[PDB]
Symmetry: C2
Subunit: 410 residues, 2 copies
């Protein structure tokens, strides 16, 4: 049985994870859900506990902790360990009965739980791209210390890339390791993008797009922050840096391609120039499931891909003039050092300002650019603890610098 913990079990990733676990378990008993962790959704967590009966429950918000304890008394033949806060999280990661941890939490807590999962040598199914972009150096160092820990990518394009690799090679290395691409014979990556809602818009039209334009009638329905990043293509920019760190692919060997059908999820060109790609309907259940079944696959009842019905797949180059956030991401990744930390942090601020109708489309890239221009490279700390503090300091500085730029112009 695959023993799995879900962190952020009521968010999008966590709920998709439990859905595919439920459906697969109907076919064959394959997963044991050992732990669920949520912030504050005490009722939703009780409902999940009633179904999956995990050994561990944890809620972050101490003010709903007691409520959770009595709710759970309602469940027949069930006596879970019920914990709360950061230290419940740590206790779950240290448990010897847990093998794989799905990280469906953003920002701080996401990276923090990831760190604890790695320290305990677990398999970590990681969807949070911002943590790889911002703290890649730290994750790489930590993965080198904890030799049995592994990050398995859940971001759909990175899952696709991973699924295009020969496991006889993968098993000789692991993600985020130097030489990953050499060992796997990788030459180049095609990183597929939906292109978002604005591919056909002129520069003058882009000047006036609004957050409602970006959010309304969403092709793929997802959270607000990522929807805005899809609209600017900063999502793909982040995902370029994510690719580089996960797979040790040089930036000149990563090509963003706009594939509006979202059937081909990304492709890998090997050193003989043969190309392998992964394909399915847009659906996060496949990337999540693979992260938990790797290096194997199990049966599902998902809708089979009907290629004849799909009929046409298309591909075109993104215009860097229209989507300047892509160029900024490449520039930051190529400059290296903590420029990716800076890019991510400034985008966090700029994205949210645009979301809330405070700045315009090209102001997003303008602010990010100015913050990047304001950063001086720093010597990279050798010490793991010092390195994490350096990342946090830089993240905080960059957010502040973005906000200060806004406030001046405002």
């Amino acid at each position: 049985p695959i023993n799995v913990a879900i962190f952020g079990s009521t968010g999008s990733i966590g709920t998709n994870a439990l859905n595919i676990i439920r459906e697969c378990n109907k076919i064959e008993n394959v997963f044991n859900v050992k732990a669920l962790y949520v912030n504050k959704s005490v009722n939703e967590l009780y409902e999940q506990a009633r179904e999956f009966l995990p050994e561990y429950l944890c809620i972050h918000d101490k003010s709903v902790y007691e409520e959770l304890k009595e709710l759970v008394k309602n469940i027949k033949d069930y006596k879970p360990i019920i914990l709360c806060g950061d230290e419940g999280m740590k206790e779950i990661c240290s448990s010897n009965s847990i093998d794989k941890i799905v990280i469906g939490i953003d920002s701080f807590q996401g990276l923090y739980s990831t760190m604890y999962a790695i320290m305990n040598n677990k398999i970590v199914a990681l969807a949070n791209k911002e943590s790889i972009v911002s703290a890649g150096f730290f994750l790489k160092k930590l993965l080198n210390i904890h030799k049995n820990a592994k990050i398995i990518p859940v971001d759909s394009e990175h899952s696709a890339i991973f699924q295009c690799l020969d496991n006889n090679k993968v098993l000789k290395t692991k993600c985020l390791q130097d030489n990953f691409s050499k060992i796997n014979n990788i030459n180049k990556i095609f990183l597929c993008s939906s292109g978002g809602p604005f591919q056909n818009l002129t520069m003058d039209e882009l000047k006036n797009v609004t957050s409602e334009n970006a959010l309304k009638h969403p092709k793929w329905k997802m959270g607000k922050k990522i929807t805005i990043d899809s609209a600017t293509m900063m999502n793909k920019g982040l995902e370029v840096i994510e690719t580089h760190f996960l797979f040790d692919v040089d930036y000149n060997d990563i090509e963003v391609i706009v594939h509006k059908e979202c059937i081909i999820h990304s492709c890998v060109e090997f050193i003989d120039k043969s190309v392998i790609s992964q394909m399915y309907y847009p659906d996060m259940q496949i990337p999540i499931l693979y992260s938990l079944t790797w290096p194997d696959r199990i049966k599902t009842n998902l809708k089979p891909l009907d290629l004849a019905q799909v009929s046409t797949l298309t591909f075109h180059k993104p215009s860097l003039e229209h989507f300047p956030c892509i160029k900024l991401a490449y520039q930051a990744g190529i400059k290296g050092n903590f420029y990716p930390t800076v890019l991510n942090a400034s985008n966090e601020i700029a994205n949210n300002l645009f979301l809330n109708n405070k700045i315009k489309y090209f102001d997003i890239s303008s602010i990010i650019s100015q913050v990047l221009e304001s950063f001086n490279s720093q010597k990279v700390s050798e010490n793991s603890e010092d390195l994490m503090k350096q990342i946090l300091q830089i993240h905080s500085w960059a957010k502040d610098k973005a906000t200060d730029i806004y406030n001046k112009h405002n």
Copy 2:
């Protein structure tokens, strides 16, 4: 170093093989061409010998044997073992200095050299699909006896399929072994076809097509027999049976899909419904190379796929009414026993009759259908030598029946 023999070195597969070997060896010394085998092209063989300096030369036509000996005296610092005929071929197959053998010969001599390669426990890069269709039972039986022999597919779609599989699983089985698909978690195959030159003709237009039409302006340039089979889609029919036998995939799980761009070479759906595909420009060098590098890949200087330039990929269902040979192939495969041997043999005759303007397009499938209707299933010989004789008898009978049917209606 990879020690390779090429059987049929002056044909299309053989010359693509030597071209990719030459180019790859410029990058890094990887291949030793140990043996070359041709029918009668003494001058061309001498030129390949001058370049590749193989330890073995073999010519099937005894009447050019002496000529070859003299020619070779022209080569400085070179003293090859120079051989001839079927027995020269057996001698090459049994050499301990040869590891991999490319089978780029058709018909009898293709099957015969394949058998000897297997008997000598070699890796056999097999491009001759007809031998798998006609003699599948015998190849399976032989591979079960010779445990270290392996067939690696070179037919482009079958190479694609093979390239979409995880070698961590492939290495626990082998082509033509029962349970191959189970071990590799295969659910279903998308078998891509160019559709050939007649794909958009109406039924009235099809009645009238000629072999000149099928051979003229050929999308992909290749031999006449396969070009005719591409026109009727019997090529893909044969390739469905090839798929079944190489990969132990049920016929109901093989879908022919027309992909006119010939960039995606075929796709594999796994039991979770994730799909993996292999992609490159139409170029036999990739499938040939992979057959010789598997389970590894090596660097080439081939042109990199430009997906944005390619721009559009399309997929549609073939019409069984317009391409009845497809239906016949499925029916024959599904009925099993030696119906595939009959299908292959009767097609050999019907293809050639049409090529030479003796019958019309729909007569091809008519003759095939009638021969299949005649055939009575036979008890499958347990004995390997007996089984081969049985296949050869059925092949010979089926050709004569096709010819007889032609002669009556003539």
